[PDB]
């Protein structure tokens, strides 16, 4: 489960509202320790 | 991350040769569905 | 070493411009969002006039909003802020900034700081 | 407007614990900043997404986001870490960055 906010204010109204900046947490080498990442998708691919 | 500035991804079709290929194609589709009739074109519906 | 080096007047009166310039001999600078603070010697904070990187948005804030204006030169490593009505005077300290993403908003901080703040004062 | 509100200027002296607190309205929209700046000098970032600090700075400083409240408690005092503290909560519906007001620390 993981946390997105919006672009920009993005004033075109062609790309408003499609990049979704997004952040979770993803497991390293080692079993017992946590790394925090930081990416981005596409609109098609997150339902909130 | 993206560097630079966002548009869409878009396709280019010359208007002059797309216009004469639907041309030749309507003049074909006569001979299965009467010489006189008014044939029209339309989007998609919907699904996925 | 990665730094800002800046050039500012001051001394305008109030119904003339200023044309202030922020530069960086440091890192890749053509994919960074630089950004604008001020501070009065006195308050706090109060922030001004994004961009992204590449000129494409330039949004500003609900105080100085549709009164002034940004450049954005790209390979000389050059801002441009232009302040050109000079209101009367919010005398305050302006420093250079930069933020680790590019592009947008949405949850935005600040690394390096350019501590350049020759002020606006018209005496 | 939103106010984010922070009490002027709490002094504790030489306790070995600080907590600046901060809050205001909607916090779950990333409480993210809390820049240290001495006079004359430049602001520095101290910690960034409230959990994490940028390399080079020793781990005095940590932060926490509890209820609607966030705060930032140092552990340990110096004689050259008396400055200046506040918040950089906001980004919604307006202009997105909005600093809150200050806090002067000083320790005897």
């Known amino acids: 489960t993981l946390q997105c906010t919006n672009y920009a204010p993005n004033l075109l109204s062609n790309m408003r509202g499609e990049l979704k900046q997004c952040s979770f947490n993803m497991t390293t080498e080692l079993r017992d320790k946590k790394q925090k990442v930081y990416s981005l998708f596409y609109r098609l691919d997150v339902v909130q | 991350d993206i560097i630079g500035d966002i548009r869409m991804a878009h396709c280019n079709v010359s208007k002059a040769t797309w216009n004469e290929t639907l041309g030749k194609v309507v003049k074909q589709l006569r001979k299965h569905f009467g010489n006189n009739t008014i044939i029209r074109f339309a989007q998609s519906s919907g699904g996925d | 070493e990665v730094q800002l080096v800046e050039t500012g007047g001051g001394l305008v009166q109030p119904g003339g411009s200023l044309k202030l310039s922020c530069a960086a001999s440091?890192?890749?600078?053509?994919?960074?969002?630089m950004n604008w603070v001020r501070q009065a010697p006195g308050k706090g904070l109060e922030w001004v006039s994004g961009?992204?990187?590449?000129?494409?948005?330039?949004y500003y804030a609900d105080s100085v909003k549709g009164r002034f204006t940004i450049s954005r030169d790209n390979s000389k490593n050059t801002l441009s802020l232009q302040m050109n009505s000079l209101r009367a005077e919010d005398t305050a300290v302006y420093y250079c900034?930069?933020?680790?993403?590019?592009?947008?908003?949405?949850?935005?901080?600040?690394?390096?700081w350019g501590q350049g703040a020759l002020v606006t004062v018209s005496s | 407007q939103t106010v984010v509100t922070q009490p002027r200027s709490v002094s504790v002296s030489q306790g070995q614990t600080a907590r600046i607190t901060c809050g205001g309205d909607?916090?779950?929209?990333?409480?993210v900043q809390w820049y240290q700046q001495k006079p004359a000098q430049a602001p520095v970032l101290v910690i960034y997404?409230?959990?994490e600090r940028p390399s080079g700075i020793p781990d005095r400083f940590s932060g926490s986001k509890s209820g609607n409240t966030a705060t930032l408690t140092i552990s340990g005092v110096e004689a050259g870490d008396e400055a200046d503290y506040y918040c950089?909560?906001?980004?919604?519906?307006?202009?997105?960055?909005?600093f809150g007001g200050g806090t002067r620390l000083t320790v005897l």
């Open positions: 440091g890192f890749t600078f053509s994919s960074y969002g």
């Open positions: 997404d409230d959990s």
């Open positions: 900034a930069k933020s680790p993403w590019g592009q947008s908003t949405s949850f935005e901080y600040f690394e390096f």
């Open positions: 909607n916090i779950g929209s990333e409480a």
């Open positions: 961009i992204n990187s590449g000129g494409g948005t330039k």
């Open positions: 950089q909560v906001w980004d919604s519906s307006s202009d997105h960055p909005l």
